Amino acid sequence: DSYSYGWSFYFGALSFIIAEMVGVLAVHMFIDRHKQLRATARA
Amino acid sequence: IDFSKPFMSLGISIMIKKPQKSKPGVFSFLDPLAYEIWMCIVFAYIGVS
Numbered sequence: 001d002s003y004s005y006g007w008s009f010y011f012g013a014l015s016f017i018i019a020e021m022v023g024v025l026a027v028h029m030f031i032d033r034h035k036q037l038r039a040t041a042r043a
Numbered sequence: 044i045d046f047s048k049p050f051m052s053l054g055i056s057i058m059i060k061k062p063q064k065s066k067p068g069v070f071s072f073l074d075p076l077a078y079e080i081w082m083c084i085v086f087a088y089i090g091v092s
């Protein structure tokens with residue numbers, strides 16, 4: 001091309017944070033699934 | 044007519060709007076980079092981590 005960003009812009013910026021936080025929580029669940037298998041298959 | 048000796052010497056000068064002291068803002072250390080860069084650094088930080 002004064003400008004400002006609207007909520008729809010911050011709805012995709014918030015979605016990024018929520019997605020990265022869900023991806024971290026899913027990776028922990030995966031590490032949790034395999035830790036149980038190892039612990040069960042150890043004793 | 045016959046004037047007297049000048050009691051006030053003067054001339055043609057230049058008048059401009061007096062500027063401002065431009066008191067720096069509190070969070071002005073961020074000025075070298077744009078708000079978008081600062082916001083994207085945070086996003087990049089989260090993504091990298």
Ligand SMILES: CCCCCCCCCCCCCCCC(=O)O
Nearest residue numbers: 073074076077078081082084085088
């Ligand atoms: C390790 C990555 C992040 C490092 C910390 C950077 C701190 C800056 C983030 C906040 C600034 C946001 C910009 C809004 C204010 C503005 O410049 O208009």
